[PDB]
Ligand binder design. Sequence first.
Ligand code: HEM
Ligand code: HEM
Ligand SMILES: CC(C)(C)OC(=O)N[C@H](CS[C@H](Cc1ccccc1)C(=O)NCCc1cccnc1)Cc1cccc2ccccc12
Ligand SMILES: CC(C)(C)OC(=O)N[C@H](CS[C@H](Cc1ccccc1)C(=O)NCCc1cccnc1)Cc1cccc2ccccc12
Lengths: 449, 449
Amino acid sequence: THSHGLFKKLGIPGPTPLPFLGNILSYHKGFCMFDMECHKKYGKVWGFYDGQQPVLAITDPDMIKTVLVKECYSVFTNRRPFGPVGFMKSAISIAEDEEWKRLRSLLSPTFTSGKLKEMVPIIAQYGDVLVRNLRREAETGKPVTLKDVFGAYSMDVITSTSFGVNIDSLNNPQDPFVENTKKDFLDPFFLSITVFPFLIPILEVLNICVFPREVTNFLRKSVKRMKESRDFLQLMIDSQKALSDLELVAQSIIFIFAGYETTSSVLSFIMYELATHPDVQQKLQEEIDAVLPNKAPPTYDTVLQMEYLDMVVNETLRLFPIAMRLERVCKKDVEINGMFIPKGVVVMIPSYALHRDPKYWTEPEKFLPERFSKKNKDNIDPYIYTPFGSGPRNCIGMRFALMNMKLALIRVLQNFSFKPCKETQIPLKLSLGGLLQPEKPVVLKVESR
Amino acid sequence: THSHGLFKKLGIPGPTPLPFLGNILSYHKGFCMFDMECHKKYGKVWGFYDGQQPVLAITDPDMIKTVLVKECYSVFTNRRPFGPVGFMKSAISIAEDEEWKRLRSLLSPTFTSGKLKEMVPIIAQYGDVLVRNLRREAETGKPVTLKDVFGAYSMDVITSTSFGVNIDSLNNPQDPFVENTKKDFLDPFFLSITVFPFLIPILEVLNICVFPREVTNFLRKSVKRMKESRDFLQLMIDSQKALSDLELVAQSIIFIFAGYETTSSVLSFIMYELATHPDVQQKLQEEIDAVLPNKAPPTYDTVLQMEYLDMVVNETLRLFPIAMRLERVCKKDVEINGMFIPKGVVVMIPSYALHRDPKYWTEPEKFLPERFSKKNKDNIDPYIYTPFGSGPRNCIGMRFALMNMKLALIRVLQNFSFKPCKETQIPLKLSLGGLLQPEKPVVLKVESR
Ligand code: HEM
Ligand code: HEM
Ligand SMILES: CC(C)(C)OC(=O)N[C@H](CS[C@H](Cc1ccccc1)C(=O)NCCc1cccnc1)Cc1cccc2ccccc12
Ligand SMILES: CC(C)(C)OC(=O)N[C@H](CS[C@H](Cc1ccccc1)C(=O)NCCc1cccnc1)Cc1cccc2ccccc12
């Protein structure tokens, strides 16, 4: 509790830090609730402490642009030191400074419009393996848990688009490439990571990691089997200033988690809103059958054509942005937009609280997809709606994620309807924990068309 | 490297400790090899350091009796502080002083001759489920890996004799009660545990454990489902100064590992010796069919009748005693048998090196079961052959283990023969690591009678 006078000094407001803790007991209602309050209590800029670590929470559009886009290279290049990581030190979302810039380049031409359109026929082959697994349960009038069957698709899409491994993971729940894959910032351990960051080095010297030393060393070799037995990996092996062999292994892993629990979790958020807003599900099912008659197979070009679908995805991401907040470590005593920012301070943009501020959203907690209509889609600040971040360090797999999810919805809405159950949690309650996820796993009724 | 002058002082010999390490780089050939050398180099008593931790290695029969049996309660009550353990602090093999003595009593009447004879009909039902899984592979002339099919029996015997859960684990490799269950003192981590014991408290304050916080909390509830849905557990619930609820959970866990990888690992050691000594396998198969004609089902009383079988088990345990060494923490500055022992020192008996000393064994590395014949079985010091330890803190499940393994061998040898393969590692090479286990998994040919 030494350097705790920083925010009283600069005349910057915020709640008072206790010695050695900071404002971490304020996380008992999860990040979002503490954010909503602090934006309401203190206004445009506030500060707090994550232990001995100061965090400055900005909410101004032009200030966010300078941090995410303008002075990204100069001042705000990296994210908060996350550890202990072992050999995942080299993963792009963890990597820092000139290793990020060297990895963000060797890995960018993997998500182009040419490579993304070339996965459309392959992501297609799996959207149908979903329908067979849905109709067997649809015929059996027994409520469906989305994240189970949804994640099985995202996992199936990942494995294929990355290494070619084709598994019907749903019916195949007991595969060496399935168990490993399926395996929280407010649990006992990460509370202590945020408060004993001095203990982080104690564990990087023990080969101890937040990723178990087994899954990695299973996929470490599985790749170097694939590497030497011959999608994202075919695009990465051809890329290796070249990629070290343990370095390429670490980039594969982050892709999987990225697309496995985000694609799965977001589709579960989309289906809840369609079922609890039956008129929206009706309008969508109509546009889908306009572009795609006779339950036609969707294409890359036709997916981008569907604009009520894009509206539906964005309003859901507004309500449930799995980022919650975006963060960067400032590296220089640089005053931006008239506010002196000292070195070492973490800058934090509160996405969730921003997406729910009545100052920029009329009826903010209601689900109104027409905010994003090509009529009203211009009154929207690109730096207030930040579901993939912004700028040089924004989400590297945005195009894939958006296309991945829409190819699922189209294939699903052509065939099924989704009704609320009794055990459906209406209105849904989020997590008191540290990620964007539901309290109860999402449960719905599913009827065939 | 402060208190390192202890052994130069007392005039007690041993290898020289480097500062802050001790003699731990001598473990590059595993515990056994360092033990064999030190017994040969220094004689009857030597010392060394496991970090800042002194260890005194005794090899005298009357001195071992005082440590394991006589002054067990007074001086040498506990084993070396093992951590980090979380809630397994209460497990009996970890527990210390008056909690051990309170737990060793509440749990002793679980292994009596009356309770052990009452599992004979239930362990019987599984010895046959092994034969069906062996004959399907026997018919398919494809070499067999013992620890796989053997562990599936020991696991099946454990689950039944403890909670009644009946699973054909072999054909059922993908069960929530099977995956959890199947999941080293010289790897990166425990090297650092032995050298940074000051870091052990740093991890007991993080709920971090050598047992993952998932398997436990799966069986923590699985038991309290069984506890409230209604073998070792039926004998333990009836027992609860009574057993706390998380305390009884911890005792169940240690029973499982105890009997899963010891029963399995020892049967693999027994079958290797029978196959590589075909005449012994022939004599045994003959005695078995004398007590049990027409491939008769073995019984409690008939198992104890078979004395060449007991000889075969003991000689194997001599060659491969999974204990390797027995250890106790001295708690008092007590001079025993004429040698001043300071408080805090760990006393260590080297089982493996003792079992292989030519001073007590003619042809020590050869496999001669007739050492233990009722003719020669008296020239054997009970404190030199210590496969279950000795005295108040000896193996609590010795009777079960010995009976468990013999019920397997009898059911197996009645039906199959075991021949060495080409890929059979002859003569077997042990582990350069820290446990009793083979270099290559054990591979043999199996023919039906
Ligand atoms: C619904 C889907 C997704 C959403 C909403 C999302 C959102 C985000 C956000 C907010 C960031 C941080 C951007 C910033 O700090 O400003 C990020 C980073 C990242 N995402 Fe995504 N993401 C999604 C899916 C994916 C997928 C499918 C991949 C597949 C590879 C992926 C790969 C990455 C990577 C590598 C980063 C780190 C980029 C860097 O640090 O340079 N993401 N994502
Ligand atoms: C081949 C089979 C086994 C062998 C060779 C073996 C050997 C040993 C040895 C050497 C000890 C330490 C004794 C000492 O420190 O002097 C021990 C302890 C123990 N064994 Fe076994 N064991 C076997 C199987 C089992 C089984 C099947 C169980 C089932 C419950 C079991 C339960 C225990 C327990 C609870 C302890 C700790 C006792 C205490 O600390 O008071 N063991 N075993
Ligand atoms: C700042 C603080 C200490 C509070 O927390 C972080 O430092 N944690 C991450 C840095 S490592 C993160 C951890 C990870 C890695 C593999 C498997 C599971 C978890 C990571 O690599 N996830 C990449 C995949 C992904 C995740 C989400 C969207 N798309 C892609 C900061 C961070 C990194 C990348 C994307 C992020 C998106 C939203 C919020 C934070 C993000
Ligand atoms: C002294 C030193 C620091 C080098 O190492 C130990 O402190 N480690 C054990 C103390 S905890 C042990 C660990 C464990 C617990 C659950 C699952 C896996 C591992 C334990 O509870 N295993 C009980 C089961 C068992 C194991 C073997 C034979 N039968 C029963 C010292 C110890 C305890 C009990 C039996 C032992 C037998 C031989 C050698 C050491 C023994």
